[PDB]
Each structure stands twice: as structure tokens, then as C-alpha cells.
């Protein structure tokens, strides 16, 4: 519930998220132990997907640590909650066909990256021209007579 921050449904879902975070950090320690950390190639942190999983789990753990219900910081806990949205971005390294689609999309982006640079340079030029034209001129009154 984005608005009912203290509703019973959110209270139940926070315990649910406790369960999911427990499962995710268990799988985290399993991967750390088995593959091994960044000290060698072919191990954990060699994949950006692994870094994504690690940052999700670490952010959840930090949010749990900050959950002292003291109210000292409010923006930080909300942003750490927002960090959870990468959690469904885990089912894309797991699925081979979803990963193939993602790699095709990234290959298309790499294909259009040269003309993307040209497009951004041209739009920067038009932005600078538009600033030279309309800088300081988009001011008005609620009273159209002043």
C-alpha cells in the first residue's frame, strides 16, 4: 500500500519480505561459499548479475539494520525499500530465453550507440542555441498586464 503506510496488509507484507530476504541471503551465502568471491576469475562478482543480487541483499540487510523504529532517518529507509525493485530483475539471469532477449536488446543498444552519441551531441547543440535564445525569458505573471 503506497499510501496506508501502517495498514495491516503492509504489516503482513513486511513479514513476508523478511522471509524473502532470508531466502535470498541464504542463497547469497551459498553462492559466496561455492563460487568464491572476486579474488579469482570464474567466481562471484565476475558477473554484473551477481553484483545486482548482492546489492539487493545488502540493501535489504541495511534496511533491516536501520529498522530500529527510532525515526532518526526517513528518506534513507524509503530509498532502501525502493532498492527492492531489482528483485524481479533476478528472473532474467535465471531464464535462458529471457537472458537471450536481454542480450539482443543490449546488442541493439550497442548497434545504435554511435548514432546515439551523434543524436545527443546535436540535441546538446540545440539546447545551447535554445538557451542563447530563451534564457531568462520564460517568466510571466498571473496578471497578464504586468
Amino acid at each position: 500500500d503506497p499510501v496506508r503506510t501502517d495498514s495491516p496488509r503492509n504489516n503482513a507484507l513486511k513479514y513476508l519480505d523478511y522471509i524473502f530476504t532470508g531466502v535470498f541471503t541464504f542463497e547469497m551465502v551459498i553462492k559466496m561459499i561455492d563460487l568464491g568471491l572476486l579474488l579469482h576469475p570464474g567466481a562471484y562478482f565476475r558477473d554484473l548479475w551477481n553484483i545486482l543480487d548482492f546489492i539487493v541483499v545488502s540493501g535489504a540487510l541495511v534496511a533491516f539494520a536501520f529498522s530500529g523504529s527510532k525515526g532518526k532517518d526517513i528518506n534513507t529507509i524509503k530509498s532502501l525499500r525502493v532498492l527492492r525493485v531489482l528483485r524481479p530483475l533476478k528472473t532474467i539471469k535465471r531464464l535462458p530465453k529471457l537472458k537471450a532477449v536481454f542480450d539482443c536488446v543490449v546488442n541493439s543498444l550497442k548497434n545504435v550507440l554511435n548514432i546515439l552519441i551523434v543524436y545527443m551531441l546535436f540535441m546538446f547543440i540545440f539546447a545551447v542555441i535554445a538557451v542563447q535564445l530563451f534564457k531568462g525569458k520564460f517568466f510571466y505573471c498571473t496578471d497578464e498586464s504586468k
Binding site: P2, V82, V85, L89
Partner: peptide, 15 residues
């Protein structure tokens, strides 16, 4: 769409 909808809830959901 799912990712952006969840972020929209969590950032702009209480406006």
C-alpha cells in the same frame, strides 16, 4: 512496466 510501476508506488504513491 512492473519495475517502473513498483518504483512509482514507492516514490510517488502517497502524493
Amino acid at each position: 512496466f512492473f519495475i517502473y510501476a513498483i518504483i512509482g508506488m514507492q516514490v510517488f504513491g502517497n502524493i
